[PDB]
Scaffold this active site. Structure first.
Site, PDB file in Angstrom:
ATOM      1  N   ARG A 169      36.599  29.073  42.596  1.00 18.48           N
ATOM      2  CA  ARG A 169      35.705  28.752  41.482  1.00 18.48           C
ATOM      3  C   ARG A 169      35.604  27.266  41.164  1.00 18.48           C
ATOM      4  NH1 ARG A 169      34.296  29.088  36.203  1.00 18.48           N
ATOM      5  NH2 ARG A 169      32.972  30.829  35.504  1.00 18.48           N
ATOM      6  N   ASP A 222      35.226  26.093  29.327  1.00 18.11           N
ATOM      7  CA  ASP A 222      36.666  26.257  29.297  1.00 18.11           C
ATOM      8  C   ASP A 222      37.145  26.862  30.608  1.00 18.11           C
ATOM      9  OD1 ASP A 222      36.319  28.889  26.709  1.00 18.11           O
ATOM     10  OD2 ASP A 222      35.537  28.821  28.763  1.00 18.11           O
ATOM     11  N   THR A 223      36.321  27.707  31.232  1.00 17.00           N
ATOM     12  CA  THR A 223      36.701  28.308  32.509  1.00 17.00           C
ATOM     13  C   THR A 223      36.880  27.202  33.545  1.00 17.00           C
ATOM     14  OG1 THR A 223      34.390  28.596  33.204  1.00 17.00           O
ATOM     15  CG2 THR A 223      35.413  30.456  32.066  1.00 17.00           C
ATOM     16  N   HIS A 246      32.192  22.106  26.585  1.00 17.06           N
ATOM     17  CA  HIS A 246      31.145  21.810  25.614  1.00 17.06           C
ATOM     18  C   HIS A 246      31.721  21.906  24.198  1.00 17.06           C
ATOM     19  CE1 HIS A 246      31.286  26.005  24.706  1.00 17.06           C
ATOM     20  NE2 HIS A 246      31.084  26.289  25.981  1.00 17.06           N
ATOM     21  N   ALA A 285      27.694  28.248  18.321  1.00 17.52           N
ATOM     22  CA  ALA A 285      27.599  29.441  17.498  1.00 17.52           C
ATOM     23  C   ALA A 285      27.751  30.684  18.369  1.00 17.52           C
ATOM     24  CB  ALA A 285      26.267  29.464  16.777  1.00 17.52           C
ATOM     25  N   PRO A 286      28.617  31.614  17.955  1.00 17.21           N
ATOM     26  CA  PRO A 286      28.776  32.819  18.767  1.00 17.21           C
ATOM     27  C   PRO A 286      27.510  33.670  18.682  1.00 17.21           C
ATOM     28  CG  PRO A 286      29.942  33.047  16.728  1.00 17.21           C
ATOM     29  CD  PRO A 286      29.563  31.600  16.827  1.00 17.21           C
ATOM     30  N   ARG A 302      24.208  24.125  25.321  1.00 24.68           N
ATOM     31  CA  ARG A 302      25.450  23.593  24.783  1.00 24.68           C
ATOM     32  C   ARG A 302      26.085  22.526  25.670  1.00 24.68           C
ATOM     33  NH1 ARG A 302      26.000  28.586  26.789  1.00 24.68           N
ATOM     34  NH2 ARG A 302      27.852  29.232  27.975  1.00 24.68           N
TER      35      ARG A 302
END
EC number: 3.1.3.-
Length: 404
Positions: free
Chosen positions: A261, A298-299, A16, A20-21, A91
């Site tokens: 996964r 990202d994983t 994605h 914002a964190p 996201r």
């Protein structure tokens, strides 16, 4: 005559865009004397600028795909010619939408997701919903081994990066050092936590991985002076993000974790890439089709990398799995004998292109690294693997118990 290839199908697995964190935690405030800049966007969501950067990649892919003759130069693609699948999160859905908006502006392209966006979608992580489990002992031994024997060793060999991080935080002046010779890895010992459905690291490693990502996100967002102006050159950016990449190296790329996964995605990718009469698949999408875009995390990118033995470093982009990064699978047919070839590559905006928010095009393209499937033995001059070789790699990588 003999070498000519034709592009027939493309599958893009994308992370994605910049999001914002979440609100800063007490730990975060306790490790630096300076205040964390706040974000003018619903925290945890895709920022509108993040959406723009994705749109630029969509615009780029459209030009590129037109040049390769997969999509028409003008108008909207044929119905079902382009399919977008996204994880249930905001996201990821908005990333699918921004991509669609850049690829074919004003066209109605639906972003398919599980109907129940309040529960996780196992496609993106079968461990989460209990489709299958990790072997605790094997995962523990494998991770400890790739770490050099213990997490202490792992952390010891990377003091260079940890010190660089402390420097950026002005760590020696924070409540953690004051209210204690002050070391971050010493102050927050790190341990490996392995459970049937998850693996994580605690302490310094985990905190450093999160903190270094936040800095990169500030930069990509265009926020002024990321890291309180203490990160000034490319060498520092790389050294800092090396800690983020190191955690992904242990938790997401390790084969005993990644294979399970990533199984559901491997199955989907293989089905999308295999020439076969079109049929309704998951999310009611019809496969095969021309372009399949999957909005994930990202994983997911790291899991596929570890499972398929794809390794990479991105010039100009310190994060190996950057926001908007695209793992692109392409099927090419050799006209002379109808043989099928698979090309894999990593498309991504460099940190600078994100910073300056530079529009992408055929003349000013995003960064790109061609990848090679380590296990592939049947290759062509362009470094592509045969459909059979790729299919074999996938069939041995996937974990049958984790399929949906």
């Amino acid at each position: 005559s003999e070498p000519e290839l034709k592009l027939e199908s493309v599958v893009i697995v994308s992370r994605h865009g910049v999001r914002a964190p979440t609100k800063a935690t007490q730990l975060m405030q306790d490790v630096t004397p300076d205040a964390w800049p706040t974000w003018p966007v619903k925290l945890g969501w895709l920022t509108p600028r993040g959406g723009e950067l994705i749109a630029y990649l969509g615009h780029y892919q459209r030009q590129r795909l037109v040049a390769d003759g997969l999509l028409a130069k003008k108008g909207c693609p044929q119905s079902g010619q382009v399919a977008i699948i996204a994880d249930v999160d905001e996201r990821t859905r908005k990333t699918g939408e921004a991509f669609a908006a850049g690829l074919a502006p004003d066209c109605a392209i639906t972003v398919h997701t599980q109907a129940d966006t309040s529960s996780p979608d196992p496609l993106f992580n079968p461990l989460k919903t209990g489709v299958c489990q990790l072997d605790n002992a094997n995962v523990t031994d494998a991770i400890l081994s790739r770490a050099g024997g213990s997490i202490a060793d792992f952390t010891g060999h990377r003091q260079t990066a940890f010190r660089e991080l402390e420097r950026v935080l002005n760590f020696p002046q924070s409540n953690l050092c004051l209210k204690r010779s002050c070391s971050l890895t010493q102050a927050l010992p790190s341990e490996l936590k392995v459970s049937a459905d998850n693996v994580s690291l605690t302490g310094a490693v985990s905190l450093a991985s999160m903190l270094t990502e936040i800095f990169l996100l500030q930069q990509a967002q265009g926020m002024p002076e990321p890291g309180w102006g203490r990160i000034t050159d490319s060498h520092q950016w790389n050294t800092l993000l090396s800690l983020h990449n190191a955690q992904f190296y242990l938790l997401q790329r390790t084969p005993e974790v990644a294979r399970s996964r990533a199984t559901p995605l491997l199955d989907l990718i293989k089905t999308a890439l295999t020439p076969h009469p079109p049929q309704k698949q998951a999310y009611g999408v019809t496969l095969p089709t021309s372009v399949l875009f999957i909005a994930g995390h990202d994983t997911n990118l790291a899991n596929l990398g570890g499972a398929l033995e794809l390794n990479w470093t991105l010039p100009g982009q310190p994060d190996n799995t950057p926001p908007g990064g695209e793992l692109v699978f392409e099927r090419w047919r050799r006209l002379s004998d109808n043989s099928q070839w698979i090309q894999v590559s990593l498309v991504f905006q460099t940190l600078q292109q994100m910073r300056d928010k530079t529009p992408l095009s055929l003349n000013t393209p995003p960064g790109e690294v061609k990848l090679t499937l380590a296990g592939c033995e049947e290759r062509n001059a362009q470094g592509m693997c045969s459909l059979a070789g790729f299919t074999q790699i996938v069939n041995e990588a996937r974990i049958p118990a984790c399929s949906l």
